Each structure stands twice: as structure tokens, then as C-alpha cells.
Design an enzyme around this catalytic site. Structure first.
Site, mmCIF file in Angstrom:
data_model
loop_
_atom_site.group_PDB
_atom_site.id
_atom_site.type_symbol
_atom_site.label_atom_id
_atom_site.label_comp_id
_atom_site.label_asym_id
_atom_site.label_seq_id
_atom_site.Cartn_x
_atom_site.Cartn_y
_atom_site.Cartn_z
ATOM 1 C CG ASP A 138 36.299 18.916 50.528
ATOM 2 O OD1 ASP A 138 36.723 18.886 51.862
ATOM 3 O OD2 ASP A 138 35.690 17.940 49.931
ATOM 4 C CE1 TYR A 195 46.934 30.190 41.697
ATOM 5 C CE2 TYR A 195 47.874 28.318 40.818
ATOM 6 C CZ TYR A 195 47.919 29.161 41.895
ATOM 7 O OH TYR A 195 48.653 28.920 42.895
ATOM 8 C CB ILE A 206 51.700 44.390 31.644
ATOM 9 C CG1 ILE A 206 52.597 44.140 32.936
ATOM 10 C CG2 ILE A 206 50.307 45.029 32.221
ATOM 11 C CD1 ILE A 206 52.855 45.790 33.308
ATOM 12 C CG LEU A 246 50.573 35.589 32.598
ATOM 13 C CD1 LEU A 246 49.929 35.553 33.853
ATOM 14 C CD2 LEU A 246 52.032 35.478 32.369
ATOM 15 C CE1 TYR A 247 53.454 30.438 30.867
ATOM 16 C CE2 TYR A 247 51.592 30.767 32.689
ATOM 17 C CZ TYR A 247 53.036 30.475 32.436
ATOM 18 O OH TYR A 247 53.802 30.848 33.272
ATOM 19 N NE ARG A 270 49.019 33.967 45.785
ATOM 20 C CZ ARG A 270 49.357 33.614 44.671
ATOM 21 N NH1 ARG A 270 50.346 33.967 43.717
ATOM 22 N NH2 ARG A 270 48.677 32.523 44.317
ATOM 23 C CG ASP A 278 48.030 34.478 40.072
ATOM 24 O OD1 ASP A 278 49.135 33.783 40.371
ATOM 25 O OD2 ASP A 278 47.329 34.680 38.933
ATOM 26 C CD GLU A 325 53.816 33.416 42.700
ATOM 27 O OE1 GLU A 325 54.845 32.741 42.645
ATOM 28 O OE2 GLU A 325 52.755 33.094 42.494
ATOM 29 C CG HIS A 374 52.027 28.118 44.330
ATOM 30 N ND1 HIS A 374 52.466 29.259 45.443
ATOM 31 C CD2 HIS A 374 52.063 28.644 43.116
ATOM 32 C CE1 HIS A 374 52.542 30.348 44.888
ATOM 33 N NE2 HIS A 374 52.242 30.036 43.527
ATOM 34 C CG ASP A 375 54.683 29.454 41.164
ATOM 35 O OD1 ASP A 375 54.180 28.684 40.661
ATOM 36 O OD2 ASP A 375 54.798 30.921 40.727
HETATM 37 C C1 LIG Z 1 52.341 33.119 35.150
HETATM 38 C C2 LIG Z 1 53.347 33.086 36.610
HETATM 39 O O1 LIG Z 1 54.476 34.004 36.239
HETATM 40 C C3 LIG Z 1 55.509 34.364 37.310
HETATM 41 O O2 LIG Z 1 56.010 33.215 37.883
HETATM 42 C C4 LIG Z 1 56.861 32.282 37.242
HETATM 43 C C5 LIG Z 1 57.927 32.924 36.618
HETATM 44 O O3 LIG Z 1 57.921 33.641 35.659
HETATM 45 C C6 LIG Z 1 58.824 31.516 36.213
HETATM 46 O O4 LIG Z 1 60.197 31.921 35.729
HETATM 47 C C7 LIG Z 1 59.138 30.315 37.178
HETATM 48 O O5 LIG Z 1 59.753 29.564 36.899
HETATM 49 O O6 LIG Z 1 57.713 30.002 37.520
HETATM 50 C C8 LIG Z 1 56.564 30.951 38.051
HETATM 51 C C9 LIG Z 1 55.260 30.024 37.762
HETATM 52 O O7 LIG Z 1 54.900 29.730 36.542
HETATM 53 C C10 LIG Z 1 54.760 35.153 38.264
HETATM 54 O O8 LIG Z 1 55.583 35.931 39.115
HETATM 55 C C11 LIG Z 1 53.844 34.114 39.062
HETATM 56 O O9 LIG Z 1 52.933 34.864 39.934
HETATM 57 C C12 LIG Z 1 52.941 33.515 37.998
HETATM 58 N N1 LIG Z 1 52.667 32.371 38.461
HETATM 59 C C13 LIG Z 1 51.159 32.090 39.006
HETATM 60 C C14 LIG Z 1 50.179 32.018 37.886
HETATM 61 C C15 LIG Z 1 49.668 31.011 37.344
HETATM 62 C C16 LIG Z 1 48.824 31.133 36.381
HETATM 63 O O10 LIG Z 1 49.277 30.487 35.226
HETATM 64 C C17 LIG Z 1 49.977 29.533 38.235
HETATM 65 O O11 LIG Z 1 50.153 28.667 37.039
HETATM 66 C C18 LIG Z 1 48.812 27.717 36.872
HETATM 67 O O12 LIG Z 1 48.542 28.162 35.548
HETATM 68 C C19 LIG Z 1 49.100 26.779 34.736
HETATM 69 C C20 LIG Z 1 48.535 27.079 33.004
HETATM 70 O O13 LIG Z 1 47.410 28.209 33.258
HETATM 71 C C21 LIG Z 1 48.607 25.488 35.117
HETATM 72 O O14 LIG Z 1 49.014 24.514 34.358
HETATM 73 C C22 LIG Z 1 49.601 25.232 36.287
HETATM 74 O O15 LIG Z 1 49.200 24.147 36.872
HETATM 75 C C23 LIG Z 1 49.297 26.473 37.414
HETATM 76 O O16 LIG Z 1 50.034 26.319 38.374
HETATM 77 C C24 LIG Z 1 51.290 29.504 38.885
HETATM 78 O O17 LIG Z 1 51.619 28.250 39.648
HETATM 79 C C25 LIG Z 1 51.052 30.893 39.782
HETATM 80 O O18 LIG Z 1 52.178 30.642 40.815
HETATM 81 CA CA LIG Z 2 35.827 16.560 48.010
HETATM 82 CA CA LIG Z 3 47.895 41.144 32.116
#
Ligand SMILES: C[C@H]1O[C@H](O[C@H]2[C@H](O)[C@@H](O)[C@H](O)O[C@@H]2CO)[C@H](O)[C@@H](O)[C@@H]1N[C@H]1C=C(CO)[C@@H](O[C@H]2O[C@H](CO)[C@@H](O)[C@H](O)[C@H]2O)[C@H](O)[C@H]1O
Ligand SMILES: [Ca+2]
Ligand SMILES: [Ca+2]
Ligand SMILES: OC[C@H]1O[C@@H](O)[C@H](O)[C@@H](O)[C@@H]1O
Ligand SMILES: OC[C@H]1O[C@H](O)[C@H](O)[C@@H](O)[C@@H]1O
Ligand SMILES: OC[C@H]1O[C@H](O)[C@H](O)[C@@H](O)[C@@H]1O
Length: 686
Positions: free
Chosen positions: A53, A100, A190, A194-195, A227, A229, A257, A327-328
Site C-alpha cells: 500500500d 487497472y 481501439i 481489450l479482452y 503513465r 495505459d 505505453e 510489468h509486461d
Molecule cells: C492490453 C495491453 O495491450 C498492449 O500490450 C500487450 C501486447 O499487445 C502484447 O503483445 C504483450 O505480450 O503484452 C502486453 C500486455 O498485455 C498495450 O501496448 C499495453 O499497454 C496493454 N497492457 C496494459 C493494459 C492492461 C489491461 O488489460 C494490463 O493487463 C491487466 O489486465 C489483465 C486483464 O484485464 C489482468 O489479468 C492482468 O493481470 C493485468 O496485467 C497490462 O499489464 C498493461 O500493461
Molecule cells: Ca495493506
Molecule cells: Ca478503446
């Protein structure tokens, strides 16, 4: 204030960012922890809340863990209230630990803390000269199914406790209902979800104004950076009016990002960094640094080519946030990876152009694959790891040496495994030598640098096996053997006599807004700021000192201007180009044109009489417009940031290669709203 001040919210090149997943860093207040199925105090189920936190970050600033490391900015999880649901995805339970899945952008996530905990975080960080960057994810609220209103919180959006609406029975069209993206096109990505995240509809005026009011509230709470998202997943036109809202109100460093994979270079990505008004996480740097220092799928020439090429392709390279993981991505450090690789890549990022971001736990050699395994709780707060010491020695050089904060990058020696580069800004120099080969010493002969004669001690103190550099006449270094895995940093700083601009922020704003020009050699006495050939002197220069000028943008026509500074003595600086003076406040208008049939390779664009529409220039027209999701061909549509409260003139045109086909008839006129959004629905005039 100087450029290095904690109150410089506009430019971060002198900072080192520590990227914190709030939940995974320190649980400083156990009473705010989620309970039941949403919480895992052992943090072995990495999709549940572990309890970290804002009190925990305050404790780690207070006890010197973060400040000991020389961190001057923290980037934390999105602070807004998230859904409380534990969602079961085919067996695994999932919570909003990551921040998120918003439900109220005007309230805090109570697991992180109260609004008072947030202000105490802001104040504690600032009192320790740490800037605070928050994630902000305006693309969506949370997992939703319009078919099953009982799933999660049905994507519901609240406005400070007041329910605006949910995904099922969205009669107000606060959300997009076009299905989920398959990522096939940028348009597809767009306007589709997303999912399963309920996609916000930014063309709805309530959504538009709400998210702009919400970001202003967080700027009022004193955040220093944002930042954003999923910038690839929101209309560019809306995000440019969003950036104009921030910049015309309280400009703070904003970056988004846009993911790039290995060897992916995208023109759209570069267009976004250069024209949106926000910079980007430099995935181009990150992917190449991992190829060279981690995976060995490229060598030092690949690294040289990315540094040289990115200096040109990014209009403002000093604003790009660099990192070696986040994180990604899988953590940089692997189980069987030599730790020296992590230590060199961090020494490389910290002395490289841009704004370095260190993902939390890098200094503790955390490994882990992709999400959620790259977000484990950090295991230790040990201040004596070599990686902690590498950041502790090098992160201060961003504040003290303008060549590292702003300088150009010059490769001075290279071979497949060794790069020696120099950062130069006026007479300030840093030289970094890296031997990525962990087995072979490199014989360096013929190195020439811009260092004055002297015996420079490795700023890293030999901990990554660096050595002293003896520099003779004409910057020629005495020959030396660079150790296996060796990394050394040598530097020289002095005063700049010439004004040199290293960074300007914000890079897009209307007349009357104060921008921040950072650099060296401006002098104590108020000189002149040029926006083009327009001189700005006297009272419009809000602040002038050697490293920073704050000046009001003059009432010039909208368009792109070069900025230049002349000190009190008339000596002029280098030009800092690509500044966009906006025609005024912005609103996003959706332009829809029907019956615009095109040939293969022919697309519809929009241009008009304001700089925001390219000032009637076909080469600067807005587009190609979209024609698949919201409207289908031959109707084309596009969300465009345009000056608010005024009559613009515009025409559509089709472009294929060099051929521009303008629609016939009289110019179209439209009076834009003062706030909110508007739709222009017209029919192609032959
Ligand atoms: C939704 C994301 O799309 C793009 O990034 C992807 C990319 O397309 C993929 O090819 C790569 O392997 O992974 C990336 C992350 O999934 C885009 O450029 C990113 O900005 C974007 N990622 C953001 C957005 C979210 C929201 O979905 C975060 O994910 C979180 O949400 C899911 C499902 O809602 C949770 O289960 C996860 O635990 C969260 O991480 C991404 O981490 C964030 O970086
Ligand atoms: Ca706490
Ligand atoms: Ca959108
Ligand atoms: O190839 C450019 C354009 O050409 C049209 O013929 C096609 O139907 C459109 O879908 C496309 O966007
Ligand atoms: O077993 C791992 C689990 O991780 C993810 O959340 C998937 O959505 C889920 O279906 C899978 O079973
Ligand atoms: O008035 C109609 C004219 O208006 C605009 O200036 C267009 O640039 C031009 O091509 C068009 O023919």
C-alpha cells in the site's frame, strides 16, 4: 527553481524512476488489506492482493531504502477505486491488485489507501525530492459481460460514488459494444474491447468530460507525472485533447505505453510519441537492450544502431522512458543468467538518454516470467546488493551531470561485445565503457573522448570491474584492457557558457501556458525566448536562471515552432524544435463521411483551416480515417482533436500515393463545442 528540482513536473530526464506495483512492494498498513478470497498474505497466488500500500512506500522513502538508491521518482499503480470482485478465470481467482480495473476515477483504491494516505505519499515523496507518477488507464473500467450483468461489477463506472452506468443496459452509450478486439488493426484494437474490459466510449460527452475532470483532480492532488495505459487502444484524437487538457491546465510529464516486440519498429508508434503530446515507454530501447545484454540475439552494433536511430526518430528523445523490463515483460534477470548482465543493463539504462525507469525488485535480482510472475512481492529490502550499489552510484549523475540528463550519444569505440559511448552536453561529458563478454577482456586502443586531460576515476568504483581512464592531450585515452563484464563510467562537469536547451515540457499547449525549458548556460539574467522569430522577453518570462526558464507561450498562430533561447548577452542556444502551439483548448469531434468510395490504397483524410487539421495541407491532413468498426465503408470516421468553441473550415480528400482528390463544393464549416464531444456526419461532395 533549477532543472533538477522536485518541483519540475514537466521534465524528468534528470530523474530515475522506480516503478512500483503498489501491492507487491510493502504492506505498511495491514488494516486496509482486502479480506477473504481477494487476499493472499503469503503472496504466492500472484493474482490476489498481497497487501502492499501507500503507507509501505512512505516507509520505504522514510527509512532511506528508495532515497539510498538515488531514486528521484516513483511510478505507482493506478490510484483510483477498482472493482472489489474476485473473478474466477477458468479456475484461477483474480482481483484488481494491479489497479487497472477502475470503477471510480475520483476515489482511491482503499487497499492502497485513503485520499489522505495519497496526500501523505505525495508530501513525503516531495519532502525527499521524489516525484510521483501514477498510472491512469482511461481506456476501460473493468471485466464486464453485457450478457451476464452479474459477472464482476458489470464494468460499472461511478463518479465519486455516483453510478454513471454499467455495461448491461448501457442506454447512454458510455461504453463500446462492438465485441472484443482480435488486434488485427489499430482501429479494431481501439473500438473493440481489450479482452473483457468494458471499453469506455470517449465520444460520449459524459465520459469525455468525466475522465478530463478526474485527471485534473489527481493533478490537483500534486502528482508529477502520468503513465497512460493502452495508448494504442484509444483514439489518437481523443488522447491529444486529453493531453491538451493536462497541458493547458497543470502540465506534468506524461508518457504512454504502446508495446513493441523484438525488432518491431512502427511508424505509428513514432508518430504517437512525436505528435500526441505525451512521450512513450521506449520499448525500442528496451527490446534492443534485452537482445544485446540479456538474450544475445544482437550485438553491440545493434545497440549502436538503435541509439543512433532513436535519436532521430523520436523528435524529443530526452522524454522517452527507458527500461530493461517492466510489468509486461519477463524479468530481465533469469535463473541461469549471470547477475553481471542485469548490472550492466542497469548501468547502461541509467547513463543513457531518456528517463530511466527501474522496475521494483531489479536491485534484488528478482526473476520471473510473464504476468503475473514478473509481479511477485519483492523478497528483500537489502541495501547492499551490487545492483543496489550500481543504481546508488549512477542515479545521482542524472541530477549532477547534464551530459547524462540531456546529452547527445556518441559511440567512441565498438566491436561485437564492447561499446564505449559518450554523452555530451556543452562541456559536460560522461563516457561509459561496457564489455558484455563475461569471458574475454577487450583491448581498447585509440579511444578518443571529449574529456579534458586527467585521471578519471570510475564512478562505479571498480564494482563492475571498471578502471581509471588516463586522458592525455586532445581527449586521447591511454590504452587499457576492459575486464570481462567490465563497466566503467567516467565524467567531467563544468559550467556552460552558451545557452544549451536539453529539454522543454510540455511540448504542446495553447498561448498563455508556461512551458519549462531546461538546460545549461542560460545565465542569471533574463534573456530572450524565441518561438520561431517571435521574441518573448520581460514579464512573459515567468522565471529565468541558468538551468531553467519558465516562459509563457506567446499568442502566435497554432502550428509547430522552434524554440531558441538567447541569454542576456545575446548568445543563442541550439534550436529545440517541434513545439506545437495549439489554436486553443481542444475538444474531440468525430468526423463521419458517407459515400466516400475509394480505390485500393486510397484512403480518406480530413484537413482544414486550423493547425490542428494541418492548415489545408494534404501532406498534413488527418487520417487515414477508419471505416470498419463504428461505421463501415463507404462511410469513414475519425476522432480528431480540434480547437474548442470555434468555426473551423474543412474538406475531406482522398489520397492514394501522391494523388490528392479533394471533395468539390464549398468548404465545410462547423462550430465546435466548448467542451464535450460532437459528431459531424456529412456526405462526400463530388
Ligand atoms: C492490453 C495491453 O495491450 C498492449 O500490450 C500487450 C501486447 O499487445 C502484447 O503483445 C504483450 O505480450 O503484452 C502486453 C500486455 O498485455 C498495450 O501496448 C499495453 O499497454 C496493454 N497492457 C496494459 C493494459 C492492461 C489491461 O488489460 C494490463 O493487463 C491487466 O489486465 C489483465 C486483464 O484485464 C489482468 O489479468 C492482468 O493481470 C493485468 O496485467 C497490462 O499489464 C498493461 O500493461
Ligand atoms: Ca495493506
Ligand atoms: Ca478503446
Ligand atoms: O484500400 C483502401 C480502401 O479501398 C477500398 O476499395 C476498400 O473497400 C476499403 O475497405 C479500403 O479501406
Ligand atoms: O491455470 C492458470 C489460469 O490462469 C489464467 O487466469 C487463465 O485465465 C485461467 O483460465 C488459467 O486456468
Ligand atoms: O472552396 C473550395 C476549395 O477550398 C479549399 O481551399 C481546398 O484546399 C480547395 O482544394 C477547394 O477546392
Amino acid at each position: 527553481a533549477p532543472d533538477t528540482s522536485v518541483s519540475n513536473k514537466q521534465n524528468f530526464s534528470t530523474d530515475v524512476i522506480y516503478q512500483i506495483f503498489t501491492d507487491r512492494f510493502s504492506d505498511g498498513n495491514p488494516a486496509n488489506n482486502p479480506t477473504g478470497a481477494a487476499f493472499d498474505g503469503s503472496c504466492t497466488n500472484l493474482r490476489l492482493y498481497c497487501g502492499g500500500d501507500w503507507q509501505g512506500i512512505i516507509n520505504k522513502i522514510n527509512d532511506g531504502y528508495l532515497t539510498g538508491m538515488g531514486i528521484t521518482a516513483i511510478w505507482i499503480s493506478q490510484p483510483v477505486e477498482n472493482i472489489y470482485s474476485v473473478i474466477n478465470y477458468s479456475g484461477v481467482n483474480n482481483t484488481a491488485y494491479h489497479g487497472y480495473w477502475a470503477r471510480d476515477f475520483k476515489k482511491t483504491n482503499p487497499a492502497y489507501g485513503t485520499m489522505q494516505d495519497f496526500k501523505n505519499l505525495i508530501d513525503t515523496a516531495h519532502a525527499h525530492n521524489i516525484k510521483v507518477i501514477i498510472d491512469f488507464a482511461p481506456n476501460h473500467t473493468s471485466p464486464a459481460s453485457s450478457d451476464d450483468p452479474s459477472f464482476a461489477e458489470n464494468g460499472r463506472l461511478y463518479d465519486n460514488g455516483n453510478l454513471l452506468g454499467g455495461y448491461t443496459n448501457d442506454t447512454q452509450n458510455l461504453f463500446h459494444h462492438y465485441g472484443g478486439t482480435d488486434f488485427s488493426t489499430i482501429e479494431n484494437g481501439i473500438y473493440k474491447n481489450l479482452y473483457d474490459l468494458a471499453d469506455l466510449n470517449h465520444n460520449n460527452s459524459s465520459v469525455d468530460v468525466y475522465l478530463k475532470d478526474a485527471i485534473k483532480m489527481w493533478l490537483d492532488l500534486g502528482v508529477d507525472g502520468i503513465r497512460v495505459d493502452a495508448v494504442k487502444h484509444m483514439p489518437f484524437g481523443w488522447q491529444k485533447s486529453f493531453m491538451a487538457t493536462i497541458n493547458n491546465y497543470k502540465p506534468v510529464f506524461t508518457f504512454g505505453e504502446w508495446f513493441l516486440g523484438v525488432n518491431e519498429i512502427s511508424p505509428e508508434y513514432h508518430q504517437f510519441a512525436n505528435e500526441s503530446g505525451m512521450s512513450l515507454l521506449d520499448y525500442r530501447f528496451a527490446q534492443k537492450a534485452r537482445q544485446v545484454f540479456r538474450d544475445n540475439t544482437d550485438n553491440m552494433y545493434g545497440l549502436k544502431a538503435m541509439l543512433e536511430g532513436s535519436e532521430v526518430d523520436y523528435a524529443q528523445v530526452n522524454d522517452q522512458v527507458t527500461f530493461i523490463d517492466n510489468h509486461d515483460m519477463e524479468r530481465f534477470h533469469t535463473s541461469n543468467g549471470d547477475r553481471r548482465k542485469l548490472e550492466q543493463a542497469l548501468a547502461f539504462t541509467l547513463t543513457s538518454r531518456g528517463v530511466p525507469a527501474i522496475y521494483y525488485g531489479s536491485e534484488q535480482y528478482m526473476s520471473g516470467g510473464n504476468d503475473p510472475d514478473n509481479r511477485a512481492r519483492l523478497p528483500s529490502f537489502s541495501t547492499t546488493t551490487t545492483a543496489y550499489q550500481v543504481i546508488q552510484k549512477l542515479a545521482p549523475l542524472r541530477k549532477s551531470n547534464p551530459a547524462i540528463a540531456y546529452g547527445s550519444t556518441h559511440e567512441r569505440w565498438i566491436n561485437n561485445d564492447v561499446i564505449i559511448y559518450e554523452r555530451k552536453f556543452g562541456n559536460n561529458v560522461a563516457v561509459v565503457a561496457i564489455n558484455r563478454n563475461m569471458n574475454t577482456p577487450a583491448s581498447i586502443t585509440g579511444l578518443v573522448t571529449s574529456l579534458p586531460r586527467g585521471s578519471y576515476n570510475d564512478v562505479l568504483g571498480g564494482i563492475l570491474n571498471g578502471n581509471t581512464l588516463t586522458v592525455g592531450a586532445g581527449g586521447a585515452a591511454s590504452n587499457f584492457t576492459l575486464a570481462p563484464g567490465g563497466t566503467a563510467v567516467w565524467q567531467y562537469t563544468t559550467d556552460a557558457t552558451t545557452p544549451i536547451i536539453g529539454n522543454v515540457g510540455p511540448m504542446m499547449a495553447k498561448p498563455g501556458v508556461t512551458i519549462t525549458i531546461d538546460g545549461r548556460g542560460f545565465g542569471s539574467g533574463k534573456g530572450t525566448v524565441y518561438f520561431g522569430t517571435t521574441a518573448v522577453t520581460g514579464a512573459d518570462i515567468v522565471a529565468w536562471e541558468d538551468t531553467q526558464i519558465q516562459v509563457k507561450i506567446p499568442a502566435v498562430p497554432g502550428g509547430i515552432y522552434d524554440i531558441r533561447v538567447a541569454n542576456a548577452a545575446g548568445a543563442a542556444s541550439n534550436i529545440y524544435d517541434n513545439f506545437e502551439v495549439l489554436t486553443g483548448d481542444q475538444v474531440t469531434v468525430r468526423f463521419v463521411i458517407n459515400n466516400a468510395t475509394t480505390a485500393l490504397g486510397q484512403n480518406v483524410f480530413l484537413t482544414g483551416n486550423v493547425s490542428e487539421l494541418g492548415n489545408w495541407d494534404p501532406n498534413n491532413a488527418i487520417g487515414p480515417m477508419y471505416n470498419q468498426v463504428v461505421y463501415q465503408y463507404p462511410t469513414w470516421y475519425y476522432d480528431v482533436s480540434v480547437p474548442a468553441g470555434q468555426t473551423i473550415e474543412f474538406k475531406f480528400l482522398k489520397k492514394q500515393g501522391s494523388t490528392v482528390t479533394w471533395e468539390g463544393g464549398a468548404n465545410r464549416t462547423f462550430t465546435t463545442p466548448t467542451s464535450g464531444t460532437a459528431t459531424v456526419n456529412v456526405n462526400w461532395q463530388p
